[PDB]
């Protein structure tokens with residue numbers, strides 16, 4: 001009952017999920033001069049193994065890579081977090097055109113895409129869906145994508161997109177190391193927020209990396225080849241699958257660095 005189209009998109013989600021208008025909603029516009037330098041934060045560590053990936057799926061809203069999360073091998077820790085959070089999946093949000101697509105903005109600027117690495121507190125909660133209910137349940141690391149030079153590791157991912165072009169399709173996707181999609185800096189902004197899709201639960205500690213990664217225009221194009229639609233339906237391309245910035249409502253954005 002929701003999507004990113006004219007009639008079912010983000011401005012209407014509150015008709016289904018009233019928490020859409022809550023006090024802890026994501027994404028936000030990060031005003032870099034208004035973030036609080038927080039030197040008490042621990043270093044951010046993205047401790048990822050190379051062969052924990054399972055599959056790549058077009059779920060009708062994004063393309064998503066799922067991981068084995070049966071133990072704390074592939075985790076985020078430090079920064080704002082109390083203890084390790086296990087990687088469940090990563091996915092992307094992107095635009096129809098090159099000047100939009102990210103969920104977070106920085107001083108009003110959008111990027112063409114944003115990667116979300118979705119982690120959960122498996123030490124405290126039984127299931128991902130239980131963690132997704134709780135204020136301390138999830139940690140999402142956001143990485144901006146800009147267009148520029150070709151990204152070598154991204155080729156594996158963009159070559160796999162053909163086989164998941166239609167909604168509801170999946171392919172095996174082994175030995176993809178998500179560390180390959182990280183920038184060389186671990187500087188970040190962090191704030192308490194929400195899932196950016198229904199059910200919009202206010203369960204996420206956001207960690208938005210300062211430094212983007214680069215992919216080529218050809219690579220960005222392969223994302224726009226994906227479809228919102230199943231094999232038999234009139235083709236609608238998967239583009240503009242982002243929620244825009246939400247009201248800060250007095251939350252504190254912390255920064256690991258001085259701007």
Ligand SMILES: CCC(=O)N(c1ccccc1)C1CCN(CCc2ccc(S(N)(=O)=O)cc2)CC1
Pocket residue numbers: 116118129132140194195196197198199
């Ligand atoms: C058994 C039912 C069930 O498990 N769910 C459910 C289904 C229908 C209605 C209510 C709950 C859940 C399905 C997964 N979902 C979270 C997915 C998600 C969404 C956005 C991000 S982002 N963009 O913020 O990084 C990251 C992760 C939590 C609820």
Ligand SMILES: [Zn+2]
Pocket residue numbers: 091092093116196
């Ligand atoms: Zn997301």
